[PDB]
């Protein structure tokens, strides 16, 4: 409130909203940080800020194919996208599909026990 | 400066009466109505801004203090300053003849370029924030 | 309390209404000793002492005890004891604590249950009585909630 | 004397040499502080005097300067200044910045004669969390601002070692 009303005398629309979205983040709203974050990246273009609020909030929503997508387009950006595959690995083990990039996981990582794991059950999934 | 010391006169004869109120209502409006020098570029310009954010502020405040009520500004812009008349009334209770008014004075200073606001409660909180420049952590201020 | 409920930050909105309730605690003693009793014997003035001014009547004891408790049930509310908050704000009859009552039973129940909701009905047409008396004591009027 | 936790304190007390009492100091400690679980971080270098300014210019005053004589070969001289500069790094990860370029700099100077161990070390003893913790701002609009002219390009400078190595 208070907050919002000093940004809107500078009018930023910007980094104070990015911080009431962080605040409700941290806190537990969905939707409007979800609001707050995309209004921050409308008027922050894009950053590992812009792209982990909007993946955080996905994966708190259970839209881990909308988090997906955001993590694609954060990993095409990639100004440093290392979370990126480890967010896929994920979503092919919470998912043939999970094939490619259970191959990619490993390939990524060959220590990866949790990615092997996945890649075993995709090819059980002779 | 003018209208704090058409206050003082007034506070030191007996109190601030009712007719030095007005002028020193002018004085302050007018001094809050110039535009902030922003260079945005030796030279500090911090000084000018630092010192335009406490005048900014002291204008504000005492002018919505000396005027809580509306339907004043109007009529002082209107009355209190003319071609000559409202400079003549408040020049010379400033110096008391002791310049030309023609010469040397307020004069060759215009002002009915200027109109009228009342200062903004968003703005005027920016001010203060800004008069804490030159007066950190004065009590009395 | 104003300025704390006023933010949004969580970790702030705690501090500002512990505190508060912290003020409140420390005044409730103070304030039963008003039975024709001496409040505190002061003859120097240690930093703040004026009269005719700071003597409560024996008439607001009462009112300031519900906002007091109302303090305590808006601290146990913004820290997740969602039960006895509402048992705490089910003590007080004025406007604030029916319309905490009805946010909480909003945020409880968006898409809970069905037969919680005539509570919601039921609170909001004791607040439209209540605004019979035009009282504009809630935070954001009846105009944008009811 | 060995009353250095106060003559440093008189130097601190005199402006010009509060960076040769930190270069005593920690020139004395470092090699072998005899660190162990006590002494509560010998007060932090008599509380910084000790600032990487003065500290990483009296480094580079005697890293190549050696004013008399200077060794034909420098004599391990770039390896001691790349310990001092991954040691540095050690304790500011717990300066990060100064740090960084610094090791950014002396990691140049081992890929001028091509010392794969001595560069890997600069490049590795560095923390694994430079960047994010000094990453002051997220969003890429402050952080334009936030991000300096030589900070950003360092850590583009540590990014293209990594690719490098």
């Known amino acids: 409130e208070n907050a919002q009303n000093s940004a809107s005398s500078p009018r930023e629309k910007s980094m104070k909203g990015f911080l009431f979205a962080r605040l409700y983040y941290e806190a537990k709203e969905y939707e409007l940080a979800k609001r707050s974050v995309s209004s921050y990246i409308s008027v922050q273009e894009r950053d590992p800020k812009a792209h982990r609020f909007l993946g955080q909030l996905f994966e708190i929503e259970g839209n881990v194919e909308k988090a997906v997508g955001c993590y694609k387009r954060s990993l095409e950006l990639n100004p440093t996208q290392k979370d990126l595959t480890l967010r896929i690995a994920e979503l092919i083990c919470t998912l043939g599909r999970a094939e490619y990039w259970v191959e990619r996981a490993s390939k990524l990582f060959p220590g990866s026990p949790e990615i092997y794991r996945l890649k075993e059950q995709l090819l059980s999934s002779g | 400066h003018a209208g704090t010391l058409l206050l003082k006169m007034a506070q030191s004869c007996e109190v601030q009466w009712k007719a030095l109120i007005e002028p020193a209502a002018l004085c302050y409006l007018l001094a809050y109505q110039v535009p902030k020098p922003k260079s945005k570029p030796d030279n500090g310009q911090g000084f000018l801004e630092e010192l335009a954010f406490d005048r900014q502020s002291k204008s504000g405040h005492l002018l919505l203090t000396l005027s809580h009520g509306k339907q004043n500004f109007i009529s002082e812009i209107i009355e209190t300053f003319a071609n000559q008349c409202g400079q003549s009334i408040l020049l010379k209770f400033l110096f008391e003849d002791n310049l030309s008014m023609q010469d040397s004075f307020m004069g060759s200073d215009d002002i009915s370029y200027v109109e009228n606001r009342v200062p903004d409660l968003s703005e005027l909180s920016q001010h203060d924030n800004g008069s804490l420049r030159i007066h950190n952590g004065d009590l009395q201020h | 309390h104003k300025t704390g409920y006023s933010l949004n930050s969580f970790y702030d909105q705690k501090e500002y209404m512990g505190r508060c309730v912290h003020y409140w605690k420390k005044l409730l003693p103070l304030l039963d000793l008003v039975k024709q009793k001496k409040s505190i014997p002061e003859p120097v003035d240690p930093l703040f002492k004026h009269f005719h001014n700071k003597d409560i009547k024996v008439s607001e004891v009462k009112d300031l005890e519900d906002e007091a408790c109302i303090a305590f049930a808006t601290l146990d509310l913004v820290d997740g004891k969602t039960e006895d908050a509402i048992i705490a704000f089910e003590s007080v009859k004025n406007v604030v604590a029916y319309w905490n009552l009805a946010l909480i039973y909003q945020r409880k129940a968006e898409e809970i249950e069905n037969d919680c909701l005539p509570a919601e009905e039921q609170e909001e047409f004791q607040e439209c009585l209540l605004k019979c008396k035009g009282f504009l004591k809630m935070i954001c009027d009846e105009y944008s909630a009811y | 004397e060995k009353q250095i936790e106060l003559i440093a304190f008189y130097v601190s007390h005199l ?61 391990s001289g770039t390896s001691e200044e790349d310990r001092a500069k991954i040691d540095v790094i050690d304790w500011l990860v717990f300066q990060r910045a100064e740090a960084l370029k610094q090791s950014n700099a002396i990691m140049r100077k081992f890929l001028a004669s091509k010392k794969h161990e001595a560069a890997k070390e600069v490049f590795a003893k560095i923390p ?27 850590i583009r400078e540590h990014l293209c070692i990594r690719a490098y190595l």
């Open chain 4, 15 to 75: 402006p010009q040499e509060l960076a040769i009492s930190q270069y005593a100091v920690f020139l004395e400690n470092i090699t072998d502080p005899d660190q162990r679980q006590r002494c509560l971080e010998l007060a932090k270098e008599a509380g910084l005097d000790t600032k990487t300014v003065v500290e990483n210019t009296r480094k580079k005053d005697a890293g190549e300067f050696a004013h008399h004589d200077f060794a034909p070969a420098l004599d």
């Open chain 4, 128 to 154: 694994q969390d430079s960047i994010a913790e000094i990453y002051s701002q997220w969003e890429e609009q402050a952080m334009d601002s936030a991000l300096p002219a030589e900070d950003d390009n360092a």
